[PDB]
Amino acid sequence: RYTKEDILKGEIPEHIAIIMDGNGRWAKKRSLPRIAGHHEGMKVVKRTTKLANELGVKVLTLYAFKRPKMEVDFLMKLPEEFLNTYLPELVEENVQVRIIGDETALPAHTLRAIEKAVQDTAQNDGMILNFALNYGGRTEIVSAAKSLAEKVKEGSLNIEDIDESLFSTYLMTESLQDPELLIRTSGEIRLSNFMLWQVAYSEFVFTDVLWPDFKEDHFLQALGEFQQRGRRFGGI
Amino acid sequence: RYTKEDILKGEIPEHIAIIMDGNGRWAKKRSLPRIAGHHEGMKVVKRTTKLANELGVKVLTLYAFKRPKMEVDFLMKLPEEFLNTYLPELVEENVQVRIIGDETALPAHTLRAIEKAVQDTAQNDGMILNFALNYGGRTEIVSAAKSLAEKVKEGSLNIEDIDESLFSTYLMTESLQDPELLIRTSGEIRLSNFMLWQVAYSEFVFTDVLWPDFKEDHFLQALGEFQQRGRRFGGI
Numbered sequence: 028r029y030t031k032e033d034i035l036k037g038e039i040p041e042h043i044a045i046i047m048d049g050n051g052r053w054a055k056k057r058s059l060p061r062i063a064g065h066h067e068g069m070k071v072v073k074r075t076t077k078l079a080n081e082l083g084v085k086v087l088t089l090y091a092f093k094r095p096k097m098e099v100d101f102l103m104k105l106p107e108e109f110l111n112t113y114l115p116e117l118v119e120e121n122v123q124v125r126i127i128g129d130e131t132a133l134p135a136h137t138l139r140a141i142e143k144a145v146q147d148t149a150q151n152d153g154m155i156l157n158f159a160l161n162y163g164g165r166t167e168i169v170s171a172a173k174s175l176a177e178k179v180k181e182g183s184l185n186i187e188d189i190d191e192s193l194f195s196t197y198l199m200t201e202s203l204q205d206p207e208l209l210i211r212t213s214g215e216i217r218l219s220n221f222m223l224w225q226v227a228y229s230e231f232v233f234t235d236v237l238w239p240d241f242k243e244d245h246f247l248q249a250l251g252e253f254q255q256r257g258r259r260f261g262g263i
Numbered sequence: 264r265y266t267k268e269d270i271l272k273g274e275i276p277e278h279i280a281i282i283m284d285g286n287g288r289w290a291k292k293r294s295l296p297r298i299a300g301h302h303e304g305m306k307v308v309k310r311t312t313k314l315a316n317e318l319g320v321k322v323l324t325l326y327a328f329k330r331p332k333m334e335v336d337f338l339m340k341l342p343e344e345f346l347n348t349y350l351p352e353l354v355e356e357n358v359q360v361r362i363i364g365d366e367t368a369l370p371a372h373t374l375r376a377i378e379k380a381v382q383d384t385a386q387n388d389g390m391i392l393n394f395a396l397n398y399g400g401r402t403e404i405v406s407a408a409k410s411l412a413e414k415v416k417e418g419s420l421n422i423e424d425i426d427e428s429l430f431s432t433y434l435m436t437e438s439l440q441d442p443e444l445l446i447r448t449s450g451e452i453r454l455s456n457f458m459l460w461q462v463a464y465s466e467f468v469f470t471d472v473l474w475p476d477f478k479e480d481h482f483l484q485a486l487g488e489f490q491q492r493g494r495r496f497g498g499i
């Protein structure tokens with residue numbers, strides 16, 4: 028219903044966090060192998076990234092969350108295929124690439140590619156493409172707690188100086204703003220341990236559309252849902 | 264659609280956390296004053312509490328979240344009216360009453376009534392009636408962080424002993440289990456800073472029904488939604 032020219036008339040969130048899910052369900056739905064669904068999801072990452080760069084979005088976060096060895100090794104090579112394919116098309120769009128999570132659970136060849144893509148994009152000031160690999164909201168909160176405790180132990184930080192502001196700075200999204208919008212696909216209505224502190228005041232849009240089928244139109248429909256939320260009477 | 268005898272056939276969550284919202288919208292909808300809507304919400308708390316005690320629920324958490332002086336003072340006296348009216352009917356049902364949040368933002372007369380109701384219900388082992396007054400998820404997380412930092416400063420706790428388990432114990436819901444189900448009313452699809460750590464793996468049910476209109480039937484329908492979620496193929 029909502030077209031591109033209707034969404035550009037409306038407010039564009041500055042930070043959108045999408046939960047990409049349903050790659051496997053989409054492979055079964057199409058009688059394809061699972062790794063094919065993960066490949067298609069990798070391509071949807073790019074379509075969405077370009078669309079969000081067009082719309083004025085400033086930060087865009089992506090998260091994708093047992094599996095046999097083959098599928099795990101295929102997944103841990105998708106970042107390299109994604110960067111060896113679309114990194115020139117992203118530096119051309121002034122997009123900064125960053126990664127949040129535990130990088131130590133990636134193999135070296137993948138981390139080198141990731142780090143190179145980050146460093147070739149640090150001098151940019153356009154949209155931010157934020158990837159969550161091996162990311163746990165609870166483990167982020169506990170690690171911020173533990174670093175704060177380290178600083179208290181050394182004596183460089185007094186316990187009465189800790190507040191919501193200082194605590195946000197110790198999260199993996201420190202130089203970032205909280206997501207104005209959260210999107211979740213595959214039909215699940217949960218958070219599944221993603222950015223718990225950050226989605227406190229975030230509008231949640233849920234949708235049964237699987238992540239490979241989430242192209243330009245469904246993203247626009249999600250933005251129309253958001254914008255209509257913004258323009259609801261009755262008060263609060 | 265789902266009757267009581269259909270819901271009792273299915274799985275009953277052990278911990279349900281409801282976000283009571285829309286008391287004001289319900290007062291306007293019925294041309295009543297706002298304080299009347301808060302009174303009706305107070306009565307719905309009891310209907311729901313009895314229904315959940317019937318269904319086998321073990322813990323039931325309730326949260327209700329600027330206003331003119333009159334409405335604030337009326338609200339801070341609703342706990343006493345609620346306890347002076349329904350506390351015998353709750354001790355008769357073996358319900359334990361507890362309160363989480365900042366109690367120091369209540370006046371003394373209210374805190375004395377609350378504390379008395381807690382102490383007259385400590386010797387019970389039935390359902391738990393958990394009230395969130397002046398409760399902030401972010402402030403709960405930061406306070407747990409700060410107590411942990413205090414224990415590290417004194418030397419009674421080493422920083423390598425802190426984990427998701429130990430961190431849960433420092434939240435206001437320490438002796439409690441995470442909510443299997445979260446319900447939110449008034450049509451809003453957000454969390455609004457409620458139990459961020461706890462709803463990590465919690466099924467969220469949203470409903471436009473205002474909290475005064477949330478009687479027995481809508482609670483059953485929410486439980487049917489949950490139970491149908493539990494019995495969905497396609498996998499994960």
Ligand SMILES: CCN(CC)CCOc1ccc(/C(=C(/Cl)c2ccccc2)c2ccccc2)cc1
Nearest residue numbers: 047065068069072091099102105106109158161
């Ligand atoms: C098997 C290892 N898992 C943990 C189980 C963690 C590592 O898996 C992942 C590997 C790649 C990605 C990923 C993309 Cl672009 C992807 C997006 C949508 C659907 C599927 C893959 C990516 C590529 C480059 C940078 C950042 C992200 C996400 C998780």
Ligand SMILES: CCN(CC)CCOc1ccc(/C(=C(/Cl)c2ccccc2)c2ccccc2)cc1
Nearest residue numbers: 283301304305308327335338341342345394397
């Ligand atoms: C004005 C003060 N606010 C903060 C703005 C905090 C204090 O307000 C509140 C006062 C009472 C309650 C409340 C009940 Cl039962 C209630 C439930 C549903 C709808 C309206 C009221 C209650 C009674 C006894 C024990 C526990 C809860 C909740 C918040």
